[PDB]
Design a protein around this nucleic acid. Structure first.
Ligand code: ZN
Lengths: 55, 68, 69, 120, 112, 96, 100
RNA sequence: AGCGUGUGCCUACCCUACGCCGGCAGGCGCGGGUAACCCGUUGAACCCCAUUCGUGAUGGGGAUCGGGGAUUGCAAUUAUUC
RNA sequence: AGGAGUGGAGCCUGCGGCUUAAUUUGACUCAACACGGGAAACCUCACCCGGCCCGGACACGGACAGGAUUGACAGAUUGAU
């Protein structure tokens, strides 16, 4: 009943199957290399990982 | 608040007091008897009874309805 | 006369299902009866054809000014 | 009065005829619709719908059932009934012609009304 | 993630920085703060508590990490510690001008 | 809020041996990772130990998508009162 | 008999000085060793916008690692290789070993 | 030719050579790669050589529209895409 | 001094306006208009039409083992076992 009403829409694909690992949002994700996080949290936490500006 | 659509309530449990009287019966001696059948499933207990409707019945954890 | 079945302009017709290669009057009459079939059956594509707009479902907010004034 | 024929087969021998050759007789879209396993993992709505269409009233006007699903493939077993269909706000009470076969139920349910332009 | 976790944690102990040293069968990390007698807790309770926290959270086998605690020398030359000290001074209701003059006087007394 | 009675006792006894547990911030995925030997939900655990936070036995602070929790002397006293164990046994949080 | 030592890091000076440490240890142990060979450094390019909102001039930021990789071949028994990789461990570099 | 990319914590969606079926998009086994190793000596386009076309809204241009066949997905009608 | 162009033709996309149960909204000279990394079939979703669950912790006063609620099969019901 309610337990199968809660699980009706599969999450095997689409934008809803992933979100940002910090701010928990579903816009502007980075799926490269397993970051799985949005571009502006990436800008906030870029240089601590090692993403340093040379180019 | 009071909208255009009227409010409809859920399945309210009526206070059916002294339902234990419907579990068993007392004869002249100390022997016991029942008016409800026994579910033989392993998921059902040995003391768990089964419902009483006009045509069929209904189990507890089993939810099997034996129909002819 | 050794022509493949997929090399035709009309395959699996609605009336007989045979593989027919229509001609100019034939294609004109078949398009006319198909348009009147959708108009009689009252589908979305028939309504778009009766109104005289696009049937393939694309944007026409900005384009399509050549239909009328 | 004309004996109408759909894809070269008449109504009786498309009515009593089996599902896999029906899928063969259909087009490419309906072939993939019916050839992707059992319609039970997600199409229980369609299952209950065509069984509620399968139960039949006596000889009068047919019963009305309402659908919230516009992606129905028309079958020979459910043709000739009276079905209302949801478009988003109201229900479009429409009749099933014998020539519905091969289409979708959403095509015959118009959603947006035609527009009219006055003074911008 | 570990740096964000420790900045969320040690808001009153004056956290400065962390380093991760790789070693087989020993995931050695060293914490750094402006005070070492408060990060351990009572008889070193909080340090092994957060050791159990990171061993349960990050999926490592038990006993992999062993967290030490080192007091940073020349605390006035670290921007994190001075910013946290100024935040602590502002949180006490002090005026911004006197606190700013005090921290800049301490910074120039440190030798910057 | 209809937690089975075995679940709260299971949460309390896993909390007794190690005085911290972690929870991913998600009320949708039900299966707890390191409670793989039994069917234990996640939102029920979250709401129950949030009620423990509301009482004040534990201390709760937030993270990226995870939770962390603490056990004080009053918290382990309440846990020993609830589980009905003598004070001769000590949790590993307060031990070397 | 053919043990292969793979070294990867991000800083180049620490990696070259620990490669010098390995080659000097192999020289003082008086065994046949081969010098390091340099793979091309794979760049880690991710380009993203600057502003959070959708206002302003279209400006972009470019970020990079410099993954420098070297590997050496040791014609030596495994026990001395195990004690060399047990000693002299730094957080700058990463030591990977394999055998087939 | 050169930047690159390529089997994943929640996850299950990777890159494809080789051998058959089919005009075609596509289908099954067959193997490698956690990557200077395998796709891949990445036989790319433009360009070059030889016929056909001959100033014509024309073999330029391909909008609009009808039918049929495939893959993705739990589902494509308001043509998903080809 | 020039070269390539745009603005003219068709198409894609965005904005204004009209219409709509709803056509969600920010941004209007450089310094907005293929911008929000916005190529939206479902999630996205913030808009509308419909019905369920609480995801109202904790204190105070009522209720309580004789009982405080959830979990449904026969036939009507939207939309659904
Ligand atoms: Zn039973």
């Amino acid at each position: 009943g309610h337990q199968q009403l809660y699980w009706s829409h599969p999450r095997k694909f689409g934008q809803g199957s992933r979100s940002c690992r910090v701010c928990s949002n579903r816009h502007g994700l980075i799926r490269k290399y397993g970051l799985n996080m949005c571009r502006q949290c990436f800008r906030q936490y870029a240089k601590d990982i090692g993403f340093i500006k040379l180019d | 608040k009071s909208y255009t659509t009227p409010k409809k309530n859920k399945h309210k449990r009526k206070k059916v007091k002294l339902a234990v009287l419907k579990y068993y019966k007392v004869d002249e001696n100390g022997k016991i008897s029942r008016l409800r059948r026994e579910c033989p499933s392993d998921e059902c207990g040995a003391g768990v009874f089964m419902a009483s409707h006009f045509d069929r019945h209904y189990c507890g954890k089993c939810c099997l309805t034996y129909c002819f | 006369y050794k022509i493949p079945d997929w090399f035709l302009n009309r395959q699996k017709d609605v009336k007989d299902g045979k593989y027919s290669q229509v001609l100019a009057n034939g294609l004109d009459n078949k398009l006319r009866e198909d348009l009147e079939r959708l108009k009689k059956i009252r589908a979305h594509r028939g309504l778009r054809h009766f109104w005289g707009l696009r049937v393939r479902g694309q944007h026409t907010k900005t384009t399509g000014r050549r239909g009328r004034t | 009065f004309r004996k109408f024929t759909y894809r070269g087969v008449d109504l009786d021998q498309l009515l009593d005829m089996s599902y896999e050759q029906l899928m063969q007789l259909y087009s490419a879209r309906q072939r993939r619709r019916l050839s992707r396993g059992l319609r039970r993992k997600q199409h229980s709505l369609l299952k209950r719908l065509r069984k509620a269409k399968k139960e039949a009233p006596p000889m009068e006007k047919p019963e009305v059932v309402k659908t919230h699903l516009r992606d129905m493939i028309i079958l020979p077993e459910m043709v000739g009934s009276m079905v209302g269909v949801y478009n988003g706000k109201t229900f479009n009470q429409v009749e099933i012609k014998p020539e519905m076969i091969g289409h979708y139920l959403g095509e015959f349910s118009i959603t947006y009304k035609p527009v009219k332009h006055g003074r911008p | 993630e570990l740096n964000e976790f420790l900045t969320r944690e040690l808001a009153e102990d004056g956290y400065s920085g962390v380093e991760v040293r790789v070693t087989p069968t020993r995931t050695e990390i060293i914490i750094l703060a402006t005070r070492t007698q408060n990060v351990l807790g009572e008889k070193g309770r909080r340090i092994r508590e957060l050791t159990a926290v990171v061993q349960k959270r990050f999926g490592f086998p038990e006993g992999s990490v062993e967290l030490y605690a080192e007091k940073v020398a020349t605390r006035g030359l670290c921007a994190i510690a001075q910013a946290e000290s100024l935040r602590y001074k502002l949180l006490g209701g002090l005026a911004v001008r006197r606190a700013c003059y005090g921290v800049l006087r301490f910074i120039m007394e440190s030798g910057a | 809020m209809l937690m089975p009675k075995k679940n709260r006792i299971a949460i309390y006894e896993l909390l007794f041996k190690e005085g911290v547990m972690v929870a991913k911030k998600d009320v949708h995925m039900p299966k707890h990772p390191e409670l793989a030997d039994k069917n234990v939900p996640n939102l029920h655990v979250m709401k129950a130990m949030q009620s423990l936070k509301s009482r004040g036995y534990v201390k709760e602070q937030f993270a990226w998508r995870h939770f962390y929790w603490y056990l004080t002397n009053e918290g382990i006293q309440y846990l020993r009162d609830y589980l009905h164990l003598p004070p001769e046994i000590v949790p590993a949080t307060l031990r070397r | 008999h053919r043990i292969r030592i793979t070294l990867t890091s991000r800083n180049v000076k620490s990696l070259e000085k620990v490669c010098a440490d390995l080659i000097r240890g192999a020289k003082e142990k008086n065994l046949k060793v081969k010098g390091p060979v340099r793979m091309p450094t794979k760049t880690l390019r991710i380009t993203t916008r600057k502003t959070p909102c959708g206002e302003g001039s279209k400006t972009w930021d470019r970020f990079q690692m410099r993954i420098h990789k070297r590997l050496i071949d040791l014609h030596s028994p495994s026990e001395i290789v195990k004690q060399i990789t047990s000693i002299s461990i730094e957080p700058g570099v990463e030591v990977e070993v394999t055998i087939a």
